[PDB]
Design a protein around this nucleic acid. Structure first.
Lengths: 70, 83
DNA sequence: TAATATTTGTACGTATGTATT
DNA sequence: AAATACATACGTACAAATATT
């Protein structure tokens, strides 16, 4: 099957920006609001995707600052 | 004398942890202390909600972090277990 | 065997707090 | 000082997998 939950598709796409070198280490990804409107999903879904990627070390978050390629 | 677990409140400096972090600390203290063994089931999310006096969201954040650490694993419809 | 209940998973809603810009 | 941005945390509903009856 080809189906993945929405947070997993957001994870895959963000991961693809990294890997592919479109976002370099210590560069900022789009804001939560920006990702929400880009994927047409809730803030919770974005935060789940980002939280997963942070847990596996792909990203880090700075409160009030942004989220960045690690 | 069984039932239920306190966690320190906070609207009121540097002794403080967020609720999900306190729940993480307690659950991980059950492991380590051998109160729960590998492949033994921890309480359900609803039991944890009632016993820590927090939302399902907070319980799921705590457990999610601990699974991410490799301390616990989940089977949906089954339960959550000590790794 | 079939149906129902339980339990975790996904997705979203809303409010408020805190750090950075 | 105000606005922006991530963090914490309360809630809802329904899906999917497992357990129970």
């Amino acid at each position: 099957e080809f189906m993945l939950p929405k947070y997993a598709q957001v994870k895959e796409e963000i991961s693809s920006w990294i890997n592919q070198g479109k976002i370099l280490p210590d560069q900022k990804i789009p804001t939560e609001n920006e990702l929400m409107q880009q994927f047409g999903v809730s803030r919770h879904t974005i935060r789940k995707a980002i939280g997963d990627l942070v847990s596996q070390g792909l990203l880090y978050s700075v409160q009030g600052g942004g989220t960045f390629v690690a």
